[PDB]
Design a protein around this ligand. Structure first.
Ligand SMILES: Cc1ncc(COP(=O)(O)O)c(CNC(C)C(=O)O)c1O
Ligand SMILES: Cc1ncc(COP(=O)(O)O)c(CNC(C)C(=O)O)c1O
Lengths: 306, 306
């Protein structure tokens, strides 16, 4: 009898798909891991469940607890969804530059939203949450950028899904970095198992903080937070690639139009990088996995579609 | 090695989830089949692939073929997606009353759209397609309301998924009817296998054509086409239930807010019906499966969210 008790048992176990047309100049094989096959259509559903389960198991949730989280949208949607199922009160801080679909979804799940200034980006969404936390003891702030449960769920689920599904043949994993939980969790398991495996972090050209540049405003929602997240393990990352806004957008569009994969802006960015890596002679016949974080329907109000 | 060759190998195999809070007065068990776990987030991805595969296998697609289909949105999105992956040209007729998200998604997959008058609903979307078909021999019109491949894919996939997943214990299946392919395909397999199984069709109170009333305008997108579709087998349906606009909407909202299931208007409607059926003393301890066709994110512009 395969019936989930609730929506939290429905996270993960996402499919890999081979790219066929969006492969210009590739000498390696590129397969995309499709994270919109999650119950609220993003990779972050994984951490939304995981961070709350961790809290529950450590006895951190009280009857009057209010969940408070800084988000660029998807974690907020993930927590709002888990809170709907659980019966928890949930508040999100989020920059006002994020897609209007994120705002509407948050509300639709009965969560509450506080918009932070767009010039301050993710750093300022964090501050408002940390600032609200100290006004009232009822707040519990998971804090995805610091929470061990974030990369942990990726070890336990994402990494094993990638390993099993490629039958250990995976050679390189390309992934945009927001909190860096995805790339870190996957590298933690796969790199120990297969020390030849390599891990490429992707970040906006317009905000290249990991590459040692200064932060800046960009449309690549979900990544380029503007600081080095505590949760990322940079010792496991083998290469950083920065992607321009226009490339990220164009490739996002080609995936929809050439592959039938309607994905968000950060998935275009990860694929630009996966393609670049796949053109290197030394990677001929290797297997590359690019993580595609979410669905493009969340972006209709953005310039991805206009 | 579990890697799909393309997006068409990723349809179906959707999860069942038990309803816990939205169960007021229920004496039967209600589990929802979650069709937004499809590659373009709706049940109709199943028929979008299936109808084109059938055409290909019968040699009906030529190099200059243009796919033309009447849709209220989701089949159109499904075909647009399959056409993106395949390299086909795809045109959709769709009433101008359908969510603006459907229009945008169609375009995003590189498909072309022709809007038909809202006062003529689905009947007029059909006419425009049949009218365009005869202007040019290049058009191929799958015609979901007549196509045998529509209920066939539901026998081969949806029905078996329901049977396997409930381990044959399913007693009643509740499903909104657009083309009626879902309910017909599922009933065709399950009812032969288990003759005690019962099948409830759901339609708008505002357009109760199957109940013997006259057609009318309604917000329950996807169902209540305004005529009896050729593809539906009414001999297999055991009961029709009509659902009011407000109930459909309210329950859609409660599923998001109480279950963490963000689903479209037609899923609210199917659940109103599934709940009504589950309150009947004679159904105490039975297992009811309600089909939840799509995700609520497609509806942000509608009154479901406002
Ligand atoms: C669409 C999208 N792509 C890529 C990423 C980067 O994922 P990692 O945190 O695992 O590196 C995120 C992160 N989301 C965040 C941070 C949020 O929704 O708050 C995202 O939402
Ligand atoms: C959201 C939604 N719910 C319920 C239904 C009814 O499904 P059946 O055709 O299997 O009865 C549909 C049908 N869609 C159609 C018809 C379309 O998108 O053109 C739908 O899109």
């Amino acid at each position: 009898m395969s019936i989930a008790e609730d929506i939290t048992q429905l996270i993960g176990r996402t499919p890999l798909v081979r790219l066929r047309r969006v492969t210009d100049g590739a000498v390696a094989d590129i397969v995309a891991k499709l994270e919109f096959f999650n119950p609220a259509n993003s990779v972050k559903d994984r951490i939304g469940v995981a961070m709350l389960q961790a809290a529950e198991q450590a006895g951190l949730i009280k009857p009057d607890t209010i969940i408070l989280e800084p988000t660029s949208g998807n974690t907020g949607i993930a927590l709002a969804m888990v809170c709907a199922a659980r019966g928890y009160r949930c508040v999100l801080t989020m920059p006002e530059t994020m897609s209007l679909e994120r705002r509407m979804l948050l509300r639709a799940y009965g969560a509450e939203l506080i918009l932070t200034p767009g010039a301050d980006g993710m750093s300022g969404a964090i501050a408002k949450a940390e600032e609200l936390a100290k006004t009232d003891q009822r707040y519990f702030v998971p804090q995805q950028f610091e929470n061990p449960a974030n990369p942990a769920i990726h070890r336990v689920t994402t990494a094993e899904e990638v390993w099993r599904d490629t039958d250990g043949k995976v050679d390189i994993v390309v992934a945009g970095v927001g909190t860096g939980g995805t790339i870190t969790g996957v590298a933690q398991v796969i790199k120990e198992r297969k020390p030849s495996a390599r891990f490429v972090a992707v970040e906006p050209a317009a905000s290249p903080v990991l590459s040692g540049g200064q932060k800046g405003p960009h449309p690549i929602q979900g990544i380029g937070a503007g600081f080095v997240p505590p949760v990322l393990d940079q010792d496991l990352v083998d290469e950083i690639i920065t992607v321009g806004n226009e490339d990220a957008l164009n490739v996002a569009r080609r995936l929809a139009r050439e592959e039938g994969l309607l994905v968000g802006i950060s998935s275009g960015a990860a694929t630009v990088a996966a393609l670049q890596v796949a053109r290197r002679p030394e990677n001929a016949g290797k297997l590359i996995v690019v993580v595609l974080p979410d669905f493009g329907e969340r972006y209709l109000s953005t310039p991805l579609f206009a």
